[PDB]
Amino acid sequence: SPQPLEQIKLSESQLSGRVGMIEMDLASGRTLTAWRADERFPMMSTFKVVLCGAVLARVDAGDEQLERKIHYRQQDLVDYSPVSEKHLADGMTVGELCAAAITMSDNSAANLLLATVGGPAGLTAFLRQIGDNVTRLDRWETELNEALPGDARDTTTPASMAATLRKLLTSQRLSARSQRQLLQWMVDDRVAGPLIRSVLPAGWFIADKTGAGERGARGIVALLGPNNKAERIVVIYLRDTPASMAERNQQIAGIGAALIEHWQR
Ligand SMILES: OC[C@H]1O[C@H](O[C@H]2[C@H](O)[C@@H](O)[C@H](OCCCCCCC3CCCCC3)O[C@@H]2CO)[C@H](O)[C@@H](O)[C@@H]1O
Ligand SMILES: *C(=O)C1=CN=C(C(=O)O)CS[C@H]1c1cn2c(n1)COCC2
Incomplete structure (x- = not known):
């Protein structure tokens, strides 16, 4: 593989899109790789990690419980509700909703959680309170994935998402x-x-949230490292490419391969 920066460039050339990336040491915050790291990219479903951060902050403050059951109705459901559509009768706990939102990308679960933290404006205020002055949520699921050219709504930067x-x-x-x-x-x-x-070498840790949107938008927020340890945060966003989903996935995987092959920097 090429060096990571070279591979990111090659992925822009091949996709005819913009790529943004950060590689950061989890423990210290050392930035090892930056590319377009202060440019804006749609968060898509990667916002769900920050959402449940905001929920957990309320739990720590005594303002929320992960056990609290939320009841909801069918009219409340949005597209792609694989877990939440099963619990119209019995409801879901706040913690179950975060599990569904992060682990399944359940969009109704995410919207129910957004309502608990004050909506998009509430989540953005949380971000400002933890010192993220860039990331912003403006819409609800599923409209936040629209990825219009030039539109700052529902965006982050690689550097801000990693720091957050x-x-x-x-x-x-x-x-x-x-x-x-x-x-x-x-x-x-x-x-x-x-x-x-399935494609990582033996010994590598992964934890992640992915997203996708219009006009080729794609992203991943991940923890990665050798020796079964979460050593680094890796954030990669793609926008404004006509490529197939499979090719976007393959280019992100190729960046991953470059990082693995050149890990000790
Ligand atoms: O010498 C290092 C390694 O080189 C290869 O591993 C390959 C692997 O066979 C391939 O499947 C993967 O593709 C990349 C898989 C990464 C998937 C994307 C993950 C990213 C996305 C951004 C967020 C973090 C995770 O590349 C590595 C490195 O060449 C060998 O197969 C393996 O035995 C050896 O230990
Ligand atoms: C999250 O990124 C996300 C993106 N995009 C759409 C869409 O393209 O319509 C809808 S909301 C949400 C989502 C939808 N699914 C997932 N995430 C996970 O895969 C299944 C469907």
Whole structure:
């Protein structure tokens, strides 16, 4: 494989799109690789990790319980509700909703959770309170995936998303049990976790959340490392490419291969 930066460039040339990426040490925040790291990209479903960070902050403050059952109605459901559509009668706990949102990308679950944290404006205010001055959520599922050219709504930057994830997972803004919970939900991702493990060498850790949107938008927020350890945060976003989903996936995998082959930098 080429060096990671060279492989990112090659992926732009091949996709005829913009790629944004950060590779960051989880423990220290050292940035090892930046590429378009201050440019804006649609978050798509990757926002669900930050959402459940906000939920966990309310639990730590005594303002929420993961056990609290939320009842909802069929009229409330949006497209792709694989878990939530099964619990119209019996409801779901706040923690079950976060599991569904992060591990299955259940969109109704995400919207029910958004309603608990004050909507998109509430989530954006949470971000500002933990010192993320860039990321913004403006819409609900599924309209937030629209990825219009030039539109700043529902965007992050690779650098801001990585810093925000590190804050949630490691900075003691969240309680110890809450940090462990957030991590475990990412470990349990069903959408891409197993697929990623199928192509990772033995010994590599993965935890992740993925997203997709219009005009080729694609993204992943991940924890990765050798020796079965979550050593680095890797954030990769793609936008404005006509490529097939399979080719976008293959280019992100190729960046992954470059990082693995050149890990000690
Ligand atoms: O010498 C290093 C390794 O080189 C190869 O591993 C290959 C592997 O066979 C391939 O499947 C993967 O593709 C890349 C898989 C990565 C999937 C994307 C993951 C990313 C996306 C961004 C967020 C973090 C995770 O590349 C590695 C590195 O060449 C050998 O198969 C393996 O025995 C050896 O230990
Ligand atoms: C999250 O990224 C996300 C993106 N895109 C759409 C869409 O393209 O219509 C809908 S919401 C949400 C989503 C939908 N699914 C997943 N994530 C996971 O795969 C199954 C369907």
